[PDB]
Design a protein around this ligand. Structure first.
Ligand SMILES: Nc1ncnc2c1ncn2[C@@H]1O[C@H](COP(=O)(O)OP(=O)(O)OP(=O)(O)O)[C@@H](O)[C@H]1O
Ligand SMILES: Nc1ncnc2c1ncn2[C@@H]1O[C@H](COP(=O)(O)OP(=O)(O)O)[C@@H](O)[C@H]1O
Ligand SMILES: [Mg+2]
Ligand SMILES: [Mg+2]
Lengths: 487, 466, 67, 39, 35
C-alpha cells in the first residue's frame, strides 16, 4: 500500500540476533549436504542454510551430518553455514488452512497471504494406541453408487484406491470430496467432514485444474490442498503426506471428523527411494529402501476413530496407488494392500467397457463392511450385492445387467444416500427388468429429476430415520410404479 | 576463478579450484581447446573440488589443464533472431550462417512457473488425424506425448503434426532435436526451407531449431532439451506468443542422465537408472507448460525401451502429459498406420462437457466395441470364428471395420506409400464412426475402410473393388 | 540502526511518487499493457469502461392445433 | 485494479532494496557493543 | 497341473464357470421341484 508496508511489515520483524550453534557444509550434491559440526543437532531435526533454505538432519554420522535439502541445492556451496533450529520438523495446523493451497511445509502458494495459524504440530508423531480408539461405525458418504453400496467406507477407516494409470482414482477422490458439501453446510455438526487432498509428484497444472474443479463446486471452503508437485525436491514429496496427516490429526484430536487423500503414495515411495539412495543407504527390492513398508504404515496408522473420552474425532485416509500393467503383486502395492482396511480395485478393461467408475466389485473389499452403512442402504445393498454376485458367476442375468447399468455413474455427480437407496430400490425390487439397458440411465436421470422435484418428504423421512420403513417402502412402491407407468 | 582439472572419466571432469569455488550449475570454460568445451558444475565434493559434466568430447584433456569459471550457467541467445537458425546445446550457431545477433541471453537453468501462474483453459486442438481427434483429442496449450517403441512411427507422426499444425499456426514454433538421427535434422531443415517456414533471406522465419543429436556425448544430449525449453520459454514470457514446442526424443534426456549418473558416483535405482530420474524429469517438464502469460502447445515423442511401457522412464513421463498417444507394434504389424493404440491413448479433454455429448458417445462406443473384440480375441484364436454367437460375430465385424477405419494415409508419407494424404475434419470423423457403429455399412468389406479419409471414400473404395 | 531508518526512509522516500505514479517504474510499462491485454482477452473484447448493450432473443414457435 | 496494485507494489518493494545498498563505521562499534550483551 | 483352464481366469475359465453353473442351476431348480 502507501504506508502499510513499513508500518509493521518492517517495524515489526523480530530483527534480533543471537548466538546460534552452526555447522559447515563439507560437500553438496543432488540435494544431500554433508555438514561438519552441528554436534548437538537432533535426528530428524530441521536445520537452516545460510541462503534462506531449510533442511532436515536425517543421517547422524560420526564425522558429518547428512542434511536433505527442502528446495534447490544450487544455492548451497561448500563451506556454507548451516544453523540449527532446535525443533523437529513441524507444520502449522488449524482451521485457517481450510480453503488454502499449501506446500509440504505449510506455506501458502495461492497468493492469499499468510495462514493465521496459532499452533504447530510435528509430522512424525505417533499414531494413537489401542485404548484411545473405538470401532468404526459412522459412514463416510462418497456419493458414488458402487462405493457407497458394495464397498462402504467408515469414518476412521483406511480404504485403498488402487489401479493403473487413467482409470479414475483421482475422480473417485474428487467425488468423495465434493459430496461432503451437503453435510458441511447443514445443521448436524457431527456429520461435517473436512477434506484434505495431498498431491504428491503430480503435475502442477493438474493440481490447478483440481483446485478449479473443487472451487467450481464450492467444495474448497472446507478442503485443504497440500501439494508437493513434480518440480519440488524429493524431501518435500516425502514430507507432504505427513504434513497433511498432521493437518488432519488436528481435527481428529478435537472432536471433528476429517478425510485425507494421498494422491498418490507410489510417488512418495519413489521420492523416499531417491532421498535414501542419495544418502548411501543400501537399496532393497527395486532399489527401494528397506523400511518403505514402515514409511507407509506409520502414516496409514494415524487414520483412527477416537472414542468419546478423547472427543470422538475421526480421520479417514484414502491412499492412492498406481500399478504398472495391472500388476497388483508388486512391492509397494502389496505393502499398502497389507496396511489398509480394504481396497477399491479399478481396471482399464472394465473402464473401456462403459463401466465407469471401473470398480471391480469382485476384488473390491471393505474389511469393516456393513458396520459402516445406514440401515436403508444396508437393507437394499445386501440383496444388491448378492444379486450382482449371482450375475457375475453366470455372465438371474437380465437383473444383473440392469444392476450393473444402475451402478454406472457420471463424473462430478455425487448423489445423496437417500437418492442412492431409492435408485437401487427401483432397481432390485423388479421395476427395471422391463426396460432395455440402453434406456436405463435415461430412466434414472428422469426418475431422479421427478423424485427430487415432487417427493422431498419421502426423501426427508429417509434422511431422518435411516430405515426404509413399511410406510416408506409402500410410498416408494407407489412412486416408482406411477413413474414407470409415466415413462 | 581459475581451477585445474584433476580427473577425467568419460563425460565427467573433476576440477579443483584454489580460490572461489563456483556454485552448482555454473558453466566452466576449458583453456587450450580448438573449440569451446564447456563444463557444467554438478556437485561439490569438498577439498575445494567440483565435479562437472562436459558438454562436448573430453578427448585430450590432461590432468592439470586450466579451467576458468564464467560466473553464470550456460547462457544461450534468445529472441526473434533465433528464428530460422540452428543452435547446439550451448547456444552456438551450427548452420554456417554467422553469429546469432540477439540483445538478451537467457540461462538454460530457470525455475519452473509457480502454482499461481497456471491457466486452466482446455480448448480443443484439431489435428486432422482420425484416431487422435476421435479418441484422444489434443488441447491448445496442453502437453502431448507420442509413446512408442523402435520403428513404429513416432517421427512420422510428429512430422505429420508439424505439417498439419505448425505451418497452419499463427505464433512461433520450436523444434528441439534431442538425441535423434542427424539426417532427420537435415531433412527437417531442408523441408522447412522449401516450405517457406524457414526463410534464409529475410526475417519472416517461424521456427527456431535446437539440435543435439545421438552422435553427441551424454552431457549435450541431457542439456539440449533445456536449451529448447529456454528458447520456447522466452517466446512465451517475453513475447506473449502462442508457441509450439516439438521435442524428439525426450527419452534421450533421461537416458543421457543415466549415462552420466553412472560416473557421478551414485547408487543406481531400478533398471540401472539414476536415483534422481523422476526429480530431474519433473524439473525439466514443469517448465514446459502454459501459464497466464502465454501458451506452449507441447508435442513430445517418447521412446519406449524394448517396447516396455512400464520402464521407469516412460512410466514416469506418463504423469506429465495432458494427452498421450501410445503407439503399438502389434498394431503396426497389421499395416494400420498410424499405429495408435486406441485402448491405451487418453486425453483429459475427452469430457462431454468439453467436446460434446455426440463426440463423447461416439468415442466411448468405439472404445467399448474394441474392448469387446479384444476380449473375444482368445476364443477367436483358439476355437475359430465359428463358435461365436451371431451377436459376437457382428461385434467382431464392426470392430474390425472400425480398426481399418482408424488407419489413415499421412501427407508426409507421400514418398513411401504412394497414396494421397487425407486430412479428415472432426465432423467427418465423428459422422463416419457413428455410421459404422450404427451398422450402416455392414455390407461393405473391411478392406474398404483401410487407409481412407472420410467415410465417403470408404464407400467409393468398396464400390471400386466390386 | 542504519536499517531501521532506511526501510522507513526509503519507503517514505518512495512516497515521492505523486509526480510519477509508479514509484519511478523506469521500465516494465512495455510489458504491463501486455498483461491487461492477456487479461482483456480473458474477459472478452468489449470496452469494459461503459455500460453493456443488449439484444434479447425470442423463443421459436409454431402452430400447434389439430392438423 | 488488483493486477495494477500487485505489480506496482512488488516493483516498489524492489526499488527500496537496490536503493539502500546504494546508500559509516559506527556499525562495527555497534557490533562490538551488541556482542558483549550476549554474555 | 490339471484345472489350469480355471486357475488362469481368462476367457476359457469364465465360460467354464458360466457353463457349469448354468447347468447346475437348471438341475437345482429341477431337483427342487421333485421335492
Ligand atoms: N466416473 C467417471 N465417468 C466418466 N469418466 C470418468 C470417470 N472417472 C474418470 N473418468 C475419466 O477417465 C479419465 C481418468 O481420469 P482420472 O484422473 O480420474 O484417473 P487417474 O487414476 O487419476 O489417472 P492419472 O493420475 O494417471 O492421470 C479422465 O479423463 C476422466 O475424465
Ligand atoms: N503413418 C505412417 N504411414 C505409413 N508408414 C508409416 C507410418 N508411420 C510409420 N510408418 C512406417 O514405419 C517406419 C517407422 O518410421 P519412424 O516414424 O521413423 O519410427 P520411429 O521414429 O518411432 O523409430 C517408417 O519408415 C514408415 O515406413
Ligand atoms: Mg490422478
Ligand atoms: Mg524416431
Amino acid at each position: 500500500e502507501m504506508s502499510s508496508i513499513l508500518e509493521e511489515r518492517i517495524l515489526g520483524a523480530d530483527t534480533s540476533v543471537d548466538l546460534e550453534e552452526t555447522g559447515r557444509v563439507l560437500s553438496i550434491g543432488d540435494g544431500i549436504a554433508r555438514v561438519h559440526g552441528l554436534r548437538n543437532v537432533q535426528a530428524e531435526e530441521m536445520v537452516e542454510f545460510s541462503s534462506g533454505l531449510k533442511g532436515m538432519s536425517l543421517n547422524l554420522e560420526p564425522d558429518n551430518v547428512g542434511v536433505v535439502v527442502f528446495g534447490n541445492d544450487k544455492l548451497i556451496k561448500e563451506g556454507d553455514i548451516v544453523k540449527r533450529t532446535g525443533a523437529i520438523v513441524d507444520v502449522p495446523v488449524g482451521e485457517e488452512l481450510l480453503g488454502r493451497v499449501v506446500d509440504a511445509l505449510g506455506n501458502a502458494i495461492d497468493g492469499k497471504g499468510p495462514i493465521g495459524s496459532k499452533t504447530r504440530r510435528r509430522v512424525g508423531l505417533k499414531a494413537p494406541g489401542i485404548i484411545p480408539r473405538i470401532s468404526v461405525r459412522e459412514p463416510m458418504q462418497t456419493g458414488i453408487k458402487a462405493v457407497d453400496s458394495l464397498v462402504p467406507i467408515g469414518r476412521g477407516q483406511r480404504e485403498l484406491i488402487i489401479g493403473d494409470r487413467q482409470t479414475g482414482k483421482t475422480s473417485i477422490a474428487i467425488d468423495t470430496i465434493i459430496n461432503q458439501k451437503r453435510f458441511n453446510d447443514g445443521s448436524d455438526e457431527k456429520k461435517k467432514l473436512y477434506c484434505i487432498y495431498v498431491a504428491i509428484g503430480q503435475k502442477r497444472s493438474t493440481v490447478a485444474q483440481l483446485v478449479k474443479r473443487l472451487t467450481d463446486a464450492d467444495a474448497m471452503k472446507y478442503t485443504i490442498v497440500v501439494s508437493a508437485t513434480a518440480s519440488d525436491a524429493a524431501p518435500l514429496q516425502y514430507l507432504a503426506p505427513y504434513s497433511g496427516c498432521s493437518m488432519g490429526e488436528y481435527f481428529r484430536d478435537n472432536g471433528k471428523h476429517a478425510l485425507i487423500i494421498y494422491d498418490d503414495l507410489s510417488k512418495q515411495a519413489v521420492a523416499y527411494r531417491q532421498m535414501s539412495l542419495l544418502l548411501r543407504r543400501p537399496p532393497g527390492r527395486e532399489a527401494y529402501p528397506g523400511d518403505v513398508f514402515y514409511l507407509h504404515s506409520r502414516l496409514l496408522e494415524r487414520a483412527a476413530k477416537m472414542n468419546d473420552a478423547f472427543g470422538g474425532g475421526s480421520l479417514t485416509a484414502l491412499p492412492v496407488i498406481e500399478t504398472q500393467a495391472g500388476d497388483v503383486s508388486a512391492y509397494i502395492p502389496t505393502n499398502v494392500i497389507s496396511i489398509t482396511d480394504g481396497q477399491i480395485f479399478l481396471e482399464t478393461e472394465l473402464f473401456y467397457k462403459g463401466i465407469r467408475p471401473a470398480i471391480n466389485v469382485g476384488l473390491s473389499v471393505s474389511r469393516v463392511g456393513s458396520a459402516a452403512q445406514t440401515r436403508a442402504m444396508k437393507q437394499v445393498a445386501g440383496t444388491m450385492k448378492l444379486e450382482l454376485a449371482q450375475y457375475r458367476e453366470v455372465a438371474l442375468l437380465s437383473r444383473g445387467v440392469r444392476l450393473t447399468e444402475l451402478l454406472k455413474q457420471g463424473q462430478y455427480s455425487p448423489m445423496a444416500i437417500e437418492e442412492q437407496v431409492a435408485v437401487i430400490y427401483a432397481g432390485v425390487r423388479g421395476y427395471l427388468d422391463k426396460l432395455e439397458p440402453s434406456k436405463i440411465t435415461k430412466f434414472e436421470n428422469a426418475f431422479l429429476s421427478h423424485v427430487v422435484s415432487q417427493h422431498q418428504a419421502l426423501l426427508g423421512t429417509i434422511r431422518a430415520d435411516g430405515k426404509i420403513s413399511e410406510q416408506s417402502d409402500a410410498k416408494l412402491k407407489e412412486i416408482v410404479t406411477n413413474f414407470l407407468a409415466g415413462f | 576463478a581459475t581451477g585445474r582439472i584433476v580427473a577425467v572419466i568419460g563425460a565427467v571432469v573433476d576440477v579443483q579450484f584454489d580460490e572461489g569455488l563456483p556454485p552448482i550449475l555454473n558453466a566452466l570454460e576449458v583453456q587450450g581447446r580448438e573449440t569451446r568445451l564447456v563444463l557444467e558444475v554438478a556437485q561439490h565434493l569438498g577439498e575445494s573440488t567440483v565435479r562437472t559434466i562436459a558438454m562436448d568430447g573430453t578427448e585430450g584433456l590432461v590432468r592439470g589443464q586450466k579451467v576458468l569459471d564464467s560466473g553464470a550457467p550456460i547462457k544461450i541467445p534468445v529472441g526473434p533472431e533465433t528464428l530460422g537458425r540452428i543452435m547446439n546445446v550451448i547456444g552456438e550457431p551450427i548452420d554456417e550462417r554467422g553469429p546469432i545477433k540477439t540483445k538478451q541471453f537467457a540461462p538454460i537453468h530457470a525455475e519452473a512457473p509457480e502454482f499461481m501462474e497456471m491457466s486452466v483453459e482446455q480448448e480443443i486442438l484439431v489435428t486432422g488425424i482420425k484416431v487422435v481427434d476421435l479418441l484422444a483429442p489434443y488441447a491448445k496449450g496442453g502437453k502431448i506425448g507420442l509413446f512408442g517403441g523402435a520403428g513404429v512411427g513416432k517421427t512420422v507422426l510428429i512430422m505429420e503434426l508439424i505439417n498439419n499444425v505448425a505451418k497452419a499456426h499463427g505464433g512461433y514454433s520450436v523444434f528441439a532435436g534431442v538425441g535423434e538421427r542427424t539426417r532427420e535434422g537435415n531433412d527437417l531443415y531442408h523441408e522447412m526451407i522449401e516450405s517457406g517456414v524457414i526463410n534464409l533471406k529475410d526475417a519472416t522465419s517461424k521456427v527456431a531449431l535446437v539440435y543435439g543429436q545421438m552422435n553427441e556425448p551424454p552431457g549435450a544430449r541431457a542439456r539440449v532439451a533445456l536449451t529448447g525449453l529456454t528458447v520456447a520459454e522466452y517466446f512465451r514470457d517475453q513475447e506473449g506468443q502462442d508457441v509450439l514446442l516439438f521435442i524428439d526424443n525426450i527419452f534421450r534426456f533421461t537416458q543421457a542422465g543415466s549415462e552420466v549418473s553412472a560416473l557421478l558416483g551414485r547408487i543406481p535405482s531400478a533398471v540401472g537408472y539414476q536415483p534422481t530420474l523422476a526429480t530431474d524429469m519433473g524439473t525439466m517438464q514443469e517448465r514446459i507448460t502454459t501459464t497466464k502469460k502465454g501458451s506452449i502447445t507441447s508435442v513430445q515423442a517418447i521412446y519406449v525401451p524394448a517396447d516396455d511401457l512400464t520402464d521407469p522412464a516412460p512410466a514416469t513421463t506418463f504423469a506429465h502429459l495432458d494427452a498421450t498417444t501410445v503407439l503399438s507394434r502389434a498394431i503396426a504389424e497389421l499395416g494400420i498406420y498410424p499405429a495408435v493404440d486406441p485402448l491405451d491413448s487418453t486425453s483429459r479433454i475427452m469430457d462431454p462437457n468439453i467436446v460434446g455429448s455426440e463426440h463423447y458417445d461416439v468415442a466411448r462406443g468405439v472404445q467399448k466395441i474394441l474392448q469387446d473384440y479384444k476380449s473375444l480375441q482368445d476364443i477367436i484364436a483358439i476355437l475359430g470364428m465359428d463358435e461365436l454367437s451371431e451377436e459376437d460375430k457382428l461385434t467382431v465385424s464392426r470392430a474390425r471395420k472400425i480398426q481399418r477405419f482408424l488407419s489413415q494415409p499421412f501427407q508426409v508419407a507421400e514418398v513411401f506409400t504412394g497414396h494421397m494424404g487425407k486430412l479428415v475434419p472432426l465432423k467427418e470423423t465423428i459422422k463416419g464412426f457413428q455410421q459404422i457403429l450404427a451398422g450402416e455399412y455392414d455390407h461393405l468389406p473391411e478392406q474398404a475402410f483401410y487407409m481412407v479419409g472420410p467415410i465417403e471414400e470408404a464407400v467409393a473404395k468398396a464400390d471400386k473393388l466390386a | 540502526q542504519k536499517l531501521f531508518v532506511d526501510k522507513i526512509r526509503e519507503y517514505k522516500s518512495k512516497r515521492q511518487t505523486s509526480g510519477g505514479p509508479v514509484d519511478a517504474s523506469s521500465e516494465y510499462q512495455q510489458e504491463l499493457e501486455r498483461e491487461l491485454f492477456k487479461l482483456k482477452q480473458m474477459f472478452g473484447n468489449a470496452d469494459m469502461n461503459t455500460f453493456p448493450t443488449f439484444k434479447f432473443e425470442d423463443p421459436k414457435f409454431e402452430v400447434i392445433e389439430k392438423p | 485494479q488488483n493486477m495494477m496494485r500487485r505489480k506496482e507494489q512488488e516493483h516498489m518493494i524492489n526499488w527500496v532494496e537496490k536503493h539502500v545498498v546504494q546508500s559509516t563505521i559506527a556499525k562495527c562499534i555497534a557490533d562490538l557493543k551488541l556482542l558483549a550483551k550476549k554474555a | 497341473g490339471a484345472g489350469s483352464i480355471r486357475e488362469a481366469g481368462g476367457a476359457f475359465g469364465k465360460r467354464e464357470q458360466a457353463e457349469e453353473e448354468r447347468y447346475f442351476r437348471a438341475q437345482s431348480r429341477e431337483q427342487l421341484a421333485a421335492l
